[PDB]
From Swiss-Prot, chain A:
Induction: Positively regulated by MarA, Rob and SoxS transcriptional regulators (at protein level). AcrA-AcrB-AcrZ-TolC is a drug efflux protein complex with broad substrate specificity that uses the proton motive force to export substrates. (Microbial infection) Involved in contact-dependent growth inhibition (CDI), acts downstream of BamA, the receptor for CDI. Its role in CDI is independent of the AcrA-AcrB-TolC efflux pump complex. Signal peptide: none annotated. The lineage of its organism: Bacteria, Pseudomonadati, Pseudomonadota, Gammaproteobacteria, Enterobacterales. This is Multidrug efflux pump subunit AcrB. Homotrimer, with large domains that extend into the periplasm, interacts with AcrA and TolC. AcrA may be required to stably link this protein and TolC. Interacts with AcrZ. Part of the AcrA-AcrB-AcrZ-TolC efflux pump. It comes from Escherichia coli (strain K12). The chain holds residues 818 to 865 of 1049 of the full protein.
Curated annotation (Swiss-Prot), chain B:
It is found in: Cell inner membrane. AcrA-AcrB-AcrZ-TolC is a drug efflux protein complex with broad substrate specificity that uses the proton motive force to export substrates. (Microbial infection) Involved in contact-dependent growth inhibition (CDI), acts downstream of BamA, the receptor for CDI. Its role in CDI is independent of the AcrA-AcrB-TolC efflux pump complex. The gene is acrB. Homotrimer, with large domains that extend into the periplasm, interacts with AcrA and TolC. AcrA may be required to stably link this protein and TolC. Interacts with AcrZ. Part of the AcrA-AcrB-AcrZ-TolC efflux pump. Belongs to the resistance-nodulation-cell division (RND) (TC 2.A.6) family. This is Multidrug efflux pump subunit AcrB. Induction: Positively regulated by MarA, Rob and SoxS transcriptional regulators (at protein level). It comes from Escherichia coli (strain K12).
Length: 48, 48
């Protein structure tokens, strides 16, 4: 659970040459196409 | 759109909104103008 709601933590990294900013932006773009009632958030290192 | 009563709205606010708002930056006390749904067993004394 994350912030009082059921969650599933996903770890990953940016592919060689690409920054974390671009990798995170794509993950957001992919997260937007997910089924109704499924949100997302950044934690730990990604929150900072 | 007239699909939810104020009891339904009160439950949604209590169950989905209140907890996150109560943990939001700078928020002290949070008061719900309504009540969260419980499983109500309305007993009939004639049938008991």
């Amino acid at each position: 659970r994350y912030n009082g709601l059921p969650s599933m933590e996903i770890l990953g990294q940016a592919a060689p040459g690409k920054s974390t900013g671009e990798a995170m932006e794509l993950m957001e773009q992919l997260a937007s196409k997910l089924p109704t009632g499924v949100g997302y958030d950044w934690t730990g290192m990604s929150y900072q | 759109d007239g699909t939810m009563t104020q009891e339904d709205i009160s439950d949604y606010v209590a169950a989905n909104m209140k907890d996150a708002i109560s943990r939001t930056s700078g928020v002290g006390d949070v008061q719900l103008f309504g009540s969260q749904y419980a499983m109500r067993i309305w007993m009939n004394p004639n049938e008991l």
